[PDB]
């Protein structure tokens, strides 16, 4: 139970004193932590909301989400879903940040990250995974 692979995706409101400096520290932090924990995933940032997907052992996602929810640089955190999974969707990335510009190019209709559509996360996952992947092997 504690080991099974899961994917969690949550949406939060950005609460950044300085976006570049704040996001650099988040990526720096996460690249080392996720690697150790066995987490992989993607962070979408559009200037207003973050949408984060992390995937790994159920117990490591629980732990991480706990820490991330204690982070003052975002608010109104609410999980979209938590799903057992067969295989990682973003195995190659400890945390890949996907910022405003690239989300515009990859998923023009989802740039708002409202997640009001019932297939917005699946769509984000599909188009982002696919963009990566193309560069693989
Ligand atoms: C929206 C957002 C996403 C974050 N994602 C991660 C993450 O995926 N992995 C991680 O280790 N920390 C993440 N963090 C930062 C953590 O909250 C935590 O502060 C960090 O791991 C520890 O920084 P420190 O090692 O300097 O204390 C995120 C923070 C925010 C605001």
Residue 45, domain CATH: 3.30.70.100
Please name every residue paired with 68 in a beta bridge, in sequence order, or none if there are none: none
Domain around 88? 1-137
Residue 99 CA, ligand 1 centroid: distance in Å? 16
Short-list 66, 45, 65, CA closest to 55? 65
Cβ-in-10-Å burial (0-12, 13-18, 19+) of 77 comes to: middle
> What resolution, expressed in A, was reported for this entry?
1.9
Between 19-37 and 58-69, two packed helices, what is the crossing angle to 10 degrees?
A: 160
How many domains does the chain fold into? 1
Residue 3 CA, ligand 1 centroid: distance in Å? 22
**Residue nearest (by alpha carbon) to ligand 1 atom 2:** 68
Q: What are phi and psi of 70, to 5 degrees?
A: -80, 0
- The radius of gyration of the chain from alpha carbons, rounded to an integer in Å, stands at 14
**Residue nearest (by alpha carbon) to ligand 1 atom 11:** 30
């Amino acid at each position: 139970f504690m080991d099974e692979l899961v994917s969690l995706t949550y949406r939060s409101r950005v609460r950044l004193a300085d976006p570049v400096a704040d996001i650099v520290q988040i990526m720096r932090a996460s690249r080392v932590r996720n690697l150790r924990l066995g987490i992989t995933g993607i962070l979408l940032y559009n200037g207003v909301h973050f949408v984060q997907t992390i995937e790994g052992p159920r117990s490591a996602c629980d732990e991480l989400f706990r820490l991330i929810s204690a982070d003052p640089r975002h608010q109104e955190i609410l999980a979209f879903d938590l799903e057992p999974i067969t295989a990682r969707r973003f195995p190659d990335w400890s945390m890949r940040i996907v910022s405003r510009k690239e989300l515009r190019a990859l998923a023009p209709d989802l740039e708002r990250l409202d997640l009001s559509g019932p297939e917005d996360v699946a769509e984000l996952h599909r188009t982002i995974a696919a963009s990566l992947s193309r560069g693989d092997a």
